[PDB]
């Protein structure tokens, strides 16, 4: 007798494993719909005896599987799992060296922006609500980052090789972060329209666009008003474990002891390359696999991260 059937497990979350008896005369596709083995699309291939006992990813095709997928990924986007697997097939071949004491990514497939995201996240006090991200994030910190990168890509709506942006990616990822108690209060004054207090929560409490300087947000920054004037605003209260300050790329000085980490962007509107700046015993520039230690830094910066716990202004009235 030749082997005619094998047992395998199917899954949408790599936790709940569903036993299947596979007919070796049919493709995986004919039995399960689109099917993946460690990210590889095996929809069109027939089973091999060596597949016995292995785990295959499938698409959520009934209410139980849809619920498992929602519970794990925190999205109802039906294209998600397929995009995640498509990315994973490539990211499993990336290398994740330890550079400046952090897990970095050796350059491949225009992944510099992802390396900068990964490096930043390891330095923030952040956790993810979606179990897929939290579990992958833990593994990534130790150097097993292929799954985390594939997830970031899928959550971002980016494919492997696509040119990306750190701030855009962070906006997508932080939607799944533990920011429900993050709070920001801003005092806003327009000479025409008057005063108001703006309260922001979640992602909007930790991300700012317009200046790289947390000090400047504290002391006063210009912001457009609906009337056409420039109003001024300053930070009254902040409750979060970090803040991310972003601005269109420009030359900026970074001084050890005054920030957590940052993204350098060399380039312009068309094209650019993202590197990571951090500090340990001195300033570090981490460009994928490559470290440069620095005694000063003045260069093109787009995002600066700062530690926070709780801040309250001393500006009166
Ligand atoms: Na960074
Ligand atoms: Na995961
Ligand atoms: Na901010
Ligand atoms: Na302030
Ligand atoms: Na990097
Ligand atoms: Zn106004």
Long-range pairs of 159-165 with CB within 8 A, sequence gap ≥ 24: 159/83, 159/86, 159/87, 160/86, 160/87, 160/90, 160/91, 160/109, 160/111, 161/109, 161/110, 162/110, 163/110, 163/113, 163/271, 164/110, 164/113, 164/114, 165/113
Backbone phi, psi, residue 16, to 5°: -85, 110
Going from the Cα of 187 to the center of ligand 4, the distance in angstroms, rounded, reads 9
- Which H or E element spans position 114? helix 112-121
**Domains of the chain with CATH codes:** 1-58 (3.10.20.540), 59-182 (1.10.8.1190), 183-317 (2.60.120.1680)
> What's the rounded Cα separation, in Å, for the pair 289 and 279?
17
Find residue 187's DSSP bridge partners: 197, 234
| Rounded alpha-carbon distances, angstroms, from residue 226 to 182, 200, 233 | 26, 18, 14
> What's the rounded Cα separation, in Å, for the pair 117 and 152?
9
Asked if 77 is an active-site residue, the reply is no
User: CB count, 10 Å around CB of 280?
Assistant: 11
Handedness of CA 18, 24, 28, 32 (dihedral sign): negative
> What's the rounded Cα separation, in Å, for the pair 259 and 219?
17
Q: Look up residue 180 and give its DSSP letter.
A: T
Asked if 287 is an active-site residue, the reply is yes
Asked if 18 is an active-site residue, the reply is no
User: Which of the ligands is closest to the CA of residue 204?
Assistant: 3
User: Which of the ligands is closest to the CA of residue 189?
Assistant: 6
Which stretches does DSSP call E strand in 53-193? 55-58, 98-99, 102-103, 183-190
Experimentally determined by: X-ray
Long-range pairs of 82-86 with CB within 8 A, sequence gap ≥ 24: 82/34, 83/153, 83/154, 83/157, 83/159, 84/150, 84/151, 84/153, 84/154, 85/36, 85/39, 85/41, 85/57, 85/150, 86/39, 86/41, 86/159, 86/160
CA 266 to chain centre: 21
What is the three-class DSSP state of 173?
A: helix
Question: Which residues touch 18 (CB under 8 Å, ≥6 apart)?
Answer: 9, 10, 11, 65
Q: What is the biggest distance separating any 2 CA atoms in the chain, rounded to whole angstroms?
A: 88
Question: Which residues touch 98 (CB under 8 Å, ≥6 apart)?
Answer: 104, 143
| Rounded alpha-carbon distances, angstroms, from residue 96 to 65, 105, 117 | 32, 5, 13
> What's the rounded Cα separation, in Å, for the pair 78 and 241?
33
Residue with tokens 């292995």: 54
CA 101 to chain centre: 20
List the resolution, Å: 1.6
Which stretches does DSSP call E strand in the chain? 5-11, 18-23, 35-37, 40-41, 55-58, 98-99, 102-103, 183-190, 194-201, 207-209, 221-224, 230-239, 242-254, 261-267, 272-279, 283-287, 290-294, 297-307, 310-312
Catalytic residue among 109, 112, 149, 303: 112
What is the three-class DSSP state of 1?
A: coil
What is the three-class DSSP state of 275?
A: strand
Going from the Cα of 262 to the center of ligand 2, the distance in angstroms, rounded, reads 26
Going from the Cα of 110 to the center of ligand 2, the distance in angstroms, rounded, reads 23
User: Which of the ligands is closest to the CA of residue 147?
Assistant: 2
User: What are the structure tokens assigned to 269, written together?
Assistant: 């509107």
Question: Which residues touch 1 (CB under 8 Å, ≥6 apart)?
Answer: none
Half-sphere exposure of 130 (CA within 13 A, CB side): 23
Going from the Cα of 102 to the center of ligand 5, the distance in angstroms, rounded, reads 10
User: Which chain residues have CB less than 5 Å from ligand 5, an ion?
Assistant: 115, 276, 286, 288
Cβ atoms of 148 and 137 closer than 8 Å? yes
Cβ atoms of 236 and 197 closer than 8 Å? yes
Handedness of CA 299, 290, 306, 240 (dihedral sign): positive
Going from the Cα of 117 to the center of ligand 3, the distance in angstroms, rounded, reads 16
User: Which chain residues have CB less than 5 Å from ligand 4, an ion?
Assistant: 218, 234-235, 313
């Amino acid at each position: 007798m030749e082997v005619k059937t094998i047992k395998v497990f199917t899954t949408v979350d790599n936790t709940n494993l569903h036993t299947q008896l596979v007919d070796m005369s049919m493709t995986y596709g004919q039995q399960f719909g689109p099917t993946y083995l460690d990210g590889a699309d095996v929809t069109k291939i027939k089973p091999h005896v060596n597949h016995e006992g292995k785990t295959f990813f499938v698409l959520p095709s009934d209410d139980t599987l849809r619920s498992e997928a929602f519970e794990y990924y925190h999205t109802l986007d039906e294209s998600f799992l397929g995009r995640y697997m498509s990315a994973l097939n490539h990211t499993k071949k990336w290398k994740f060296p330890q550079v400046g004491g952090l897990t970095s990514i050796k350059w491949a497939d225009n992944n510099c922006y992802l390396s900068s995201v990964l490096l930043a996240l390891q330095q923030l006090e952040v956790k993810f609500n979606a179990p897929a991200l939290q579990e992958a994030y833990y593994r990534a910190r130790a150097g097993d980052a292929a799954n985390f990168c594939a997830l970031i890509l899928a959550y971002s709506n980016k494919t492997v090789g696509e040119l990306g942006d750190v701030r855009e990616t962070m906006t997508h990822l932080l939607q799944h972060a533990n920011l429900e108690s993050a709070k920001r209060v801003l005092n806003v004054v327009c000479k025409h329209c008057g005063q108001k207090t703006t309260t922001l929560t979640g992602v909007e409490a930790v991300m700012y666009m317009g200046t790289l300087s947390y000090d400047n947000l504290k002391t006063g920054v210009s912001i457009p008003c609906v009337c056409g004037r420039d109003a001024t605003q300053y930070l009254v209260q902040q409750e979060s474990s970090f803040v991310m300050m972003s601005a269109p790329p420009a030359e900026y000085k970074l001084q050890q002891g005054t920030f957590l980490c940052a993204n350098e962007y060399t380039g312009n509107y068309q094209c650019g390359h993202y590197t990571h700046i951090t500090a340990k015993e001195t300033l570090y520039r981490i460009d994928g696999a490559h470290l440069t230690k620095m005694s000063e830094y003045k260069g093109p910066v787009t995002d600066v991260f700062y530690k926070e716990t709780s801040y309250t202004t001393t500006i009166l009235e």
